[PDB]
Amino acid sequence: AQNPNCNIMIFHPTKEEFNDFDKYIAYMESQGAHRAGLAKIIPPKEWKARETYDNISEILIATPLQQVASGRAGVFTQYHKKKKAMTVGEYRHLANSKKYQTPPHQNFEDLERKYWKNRIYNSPIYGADISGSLFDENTKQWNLGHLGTIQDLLEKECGVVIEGVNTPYLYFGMWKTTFAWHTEDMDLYSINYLHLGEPKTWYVVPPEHGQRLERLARELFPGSSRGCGAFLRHKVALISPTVLKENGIPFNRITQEAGEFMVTFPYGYHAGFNHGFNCAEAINFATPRWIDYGKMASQCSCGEARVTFSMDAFVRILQPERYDLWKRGQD
Numbered sequence: 001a002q003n004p005n006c007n008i009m010i011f012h013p014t015k016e017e018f019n020d021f022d023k024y025i026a027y028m029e030s031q032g033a034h035r036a037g038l039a040k041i042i043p044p045k046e047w048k049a050r051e052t053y054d055n056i057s058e059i060l061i062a063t064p065l066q067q068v069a070s071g072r073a074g075v076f077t078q079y080h081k082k083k084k085a086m087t088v089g090e091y092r093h094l095a096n097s098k099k100y101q102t103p104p105h106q107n108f109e110d111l112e113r114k115y116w117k118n119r120i121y122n123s124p125i126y127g128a129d130i131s132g133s134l135f136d137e138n139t140k141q142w143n144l145g146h147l148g149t150i151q152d153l154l155e156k157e158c159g160v161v162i163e164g165v166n167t168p169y170l171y172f173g174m175w176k177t178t179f180a181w182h183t184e185d186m187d188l189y190s191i192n193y194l195h196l197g198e199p200k201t202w203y204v205v206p207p208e209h210g211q212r213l214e215r216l217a218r219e220l221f222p223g224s225s226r227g228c229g230a231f232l233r234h235k236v237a238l239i240s241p242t243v244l245k246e247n248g249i250p251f252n253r254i255t256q257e258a259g260e261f262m263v264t265f266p267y268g269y270h271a272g273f274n275h276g277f278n279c280a281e282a283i284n285f286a287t288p289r290w291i292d293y294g295k296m297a298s299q300c301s302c303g304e305a306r307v308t309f310s311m312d313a314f315v316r317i318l319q320p321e322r323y324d325l326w327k328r329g330q331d
């Protein structure tokens, strides 16, 4: 078995190997990359996402989210308070202000220490889940707005045609902005490209050990657990590496820098934070190996998780027994 310790692997494809996306994901899995739940892909030196980022300030963040924490430094939840619209230019200025900027630090490890120590005492503002793309239409390789769709994958594997579309999202972050512990909708893969700015630190639990994370989460967030049998779908809970180590939960960590891709694999729980002002683009995708994970994915039916139009068909086809109850939660 390849990568039996479930380490995060880093890949360096040649320009030739960067031509066929599906084939390269399949290659990575042949090397055991999926066991970690997360892989880094460094694009060939000849590749670029677009010519420059000079003209992005007029993008609108229609609903910036202030991430308010409750709990203790290592075990907290966050809620999102909606703020008034601002442009990326305005947001970047806010991120760089004395109230919100990255503090002096020695290295990534010192910054990670300061994150876990101090996150709960501040409320950073996140421009998340903005439909759109920063890839140039002429970028042919690993252009997240030109991937084959999940609906076409399901049709090719299962023979059923379904409604729905699949488009990318932009994330504008600042120091301390946080992504809570989650897997993707329907335990899909995700791919994330860090277009510009400061790094993003990731934490991930191997898919084979996801249930260990879920059990700890039920112990640490006991009222949440009673309210819903899949409350990590709400994307609100944070657990520090210290706490995970104290409870013997297997995980790994890695920092993504501008110009690098990360891939999350089906049922790979992940969480993390941004180091300073940045802009990432991400999209879900599927492969044939995903189908069985889709069939087994947990679902939130309490009504909190509220997701996209396209998830309907996935639940309807892959999880027909669940469909009625899940849709009651959606409506």
Ligand SMILES: O=C(O)CNC(=O)C(=O)O
Pocket: 171, 178, 179, 190, 191, 192, 264, 270, 280, 282, 283
């Ligand atoms: O970048 C973020 O804030 C969150 N991204 C992801 O969870 C992802 O790409 O799967």
Ligand SMILES: [Mg+2]
Pocket: 055, 056, 057, 058, 059
């Ligand atoms: Mg613009």
Ligand code: NI
Pocket: 182, 183, 184, 190, 264, 270
């Ligand atoms: Ni994710």
Ligand SMILES: [Zn+2]
Pocket: 227, 228, 229, 230, 231, 233, 234, 300, 301, 302, 303, 304, 305
């Ligand atoms: Zn729920």
